[PDB]
Structure 1
Amino acid sequence: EDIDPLTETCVRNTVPCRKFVKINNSTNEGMNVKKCCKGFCIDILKKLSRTVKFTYDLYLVTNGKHGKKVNNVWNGMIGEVVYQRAVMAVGSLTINEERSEVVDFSVPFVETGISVMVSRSNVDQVTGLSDKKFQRPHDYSPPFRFGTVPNGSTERNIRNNYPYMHQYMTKFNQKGVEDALVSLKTGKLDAFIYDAAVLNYKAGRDEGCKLVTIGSGYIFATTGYGIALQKGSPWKRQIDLALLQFVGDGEMEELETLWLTGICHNEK
């Protein structure tokens, strides 16, 4: 968000996060604007910082989004931590073996995984991951649309598992998460594969709940989120035990109920 004109420091319900903004495109004018932002992970960060008494001057990532081993050099938050440029990478980060091999992780707190986003235009629709249809879809009806994005997490797993589905899915590539949803609503897209948690959140507060995920709470590649940490950093045990205590005492559940709640979802 941006600082409101009235008492222009920030709203009393969030934390200032500095960021890098480039004026226009050609001009590399790096006016490091001061703005304040909220969400989910920041709440856990505040709670953790209260119980571990450490200060922080956090900044957004500049080049690229998420992380990828592009030409043996990583961009995004992974590139920062792998270069010892910024301890902690709090955000929606998926646990992966290559990621774990490169940079240490902590234990998860919120579970998620691969989910299938196919709904009824007007008995489960597909209910199959290694199904008959999406294993050789060329010679079965007109080909279905795939929701996928370059430099992600699900696409790499699908490619290394069976590239043929990835080979066809390279035909359809989206730019933004809302772009794929808009195309699906407009009819240009039919199926979307992405992280389970974000798809669940989007479908929960959908306007009218016209779209329902393919499976009734079924996941394929169950793997929770986490926070990246510098290899050998003297923070692992403290933060790990702290958030284990947090999940034990039910603060995470309360925060999920307050935040991770849909519009209709179960209200049917």
Structure 2
Amino acid sequence: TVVVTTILESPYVMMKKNHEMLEGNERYEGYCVDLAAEIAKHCGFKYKLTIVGDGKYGARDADTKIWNGMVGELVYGKADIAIAPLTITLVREEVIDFSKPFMSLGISIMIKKGTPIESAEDLSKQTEIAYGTLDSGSTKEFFRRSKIAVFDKMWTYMRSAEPSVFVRTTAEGVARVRKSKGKYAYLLESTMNEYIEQRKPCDTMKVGGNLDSKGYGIATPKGSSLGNAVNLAVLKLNEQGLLDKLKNKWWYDKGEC
């Protein structure tokens, strides 16, 4: 039985309302739960869904050099495969293997409905509406390094802004938008932006195109015997239209706005 590590994140993996009366994999529902089933079916293996211990995605401590989250669970041998909204990055690709992207995304802008902002440019040219990002992560690093006037301009602003425009968690950014009465815009991964826009109280919306492009990939350890098959299954699923069908299902068909 293959040990799958994943993370409780909506709408990827969530516990059913009546989960206490259910067993094993049947306790969970979500985009990645359906995806795992598809992958396992096409690859031909039985599996067990396990929630990542520390509830993290995967980063290496610059001091201890220890990997946390799902990535850590793979390199230290606790799980055989990770099926989650795990962004494919250079540092992670150096210690584990990623299938080709099963979902595309990018940095996007979240505003409280009514806010007079339609793009990253609109934000850069004004200050009445504050805007920020997580105090760490690829989004912050993106602006921090962007040599693009519109983005670097936004960076200088964000850094010299008072009070701080940075938040520690995603939930904090989203709440700051909903409670700032239109005076705060939040930069985050488009997938989450699009998802929140379809959830009550339906008071936020995504605007403008994405600022960059990345993808989520299924991960397996170097040399894994699952690596190749998994990659081919992801491609097959996308080509059969299943990936788009699952996106629509969990984001819109189950939407509330």
TM bin, normalised by shorter chain, reads 0.7 to 0.9
**Any unmatched runs of 5+ in structure 1?**
17-35
Larger Rg belongs to: 1
**Matching residue of 2:210:** 219
How far apart, in 2, do the equivalents of 1:205 and 1:115 lie?
17
Runs of 4+ in 1 over 6 A off after TM superposition: none
**Secondary structure class of the residue paired with 1:69:** coil
Q: Indicate the percent of aligned positions where both proteins have the same amino acid.
A: 27
Give how far 1:115 is off: 0.7
2:221 to 223, 230, 244: 230
| 1:97 aligns to 2:97 (yes or no) | no
Greater share of residues in helix: 2
Per-residue CA deviations over 1:184-214 (Å, capped at 9, x if unaligned) read 122176111111111111112343x432223
SS at match of 2:105: coil
- In 1, are the aligned partners of 2:112 and 2:177 still within 8 Å (CA)? no
Counterpart of 1:67? 58
* Helix, strand or coil at the partner of 2:204: coil
Q: 2: distance between equivalents of 1:247 and 1:171?
A: 41
Structure 2: gaps (5+ residues): 1-14, 147-151
SS at structure 2 position matched to 1:43: helix
Counterpart CA distance in 2 for 1:58 and 1:116 is 33
236, 244, 250: which one pairs with 1:245? Answer: 236
How many pairs were matched up? 230
Match of 2:134 among 141, 148, 151: 148
- Partner amino acid, structure 2, of 1:77: M
TM-superposed deviation, 1:231: 1.0
2:106–2:190 Cα contact (<8 Å) kept: yes
Q: Give distance in 1, aligned partners of 2:60 and 2:141.
A: 11
**Which structure 2 residues correspond to residues 1-268 of structure 1 after superposition, within 5 A?**
1=15, 4=18, 9-10=21-22, 15-16=25-26, 36-63=27-54, 65-71=56-62, 72-121=65-114, 125-128=117-120, 131=121, 134=124, 141-142=127-128, 144-150=130-136, 152-161=137-146, 164=156, 167-168=159-160, 171-187=164-180, 190-207=184-201, 209-215=202-208, 218-261=209-252, 262-264=255-257
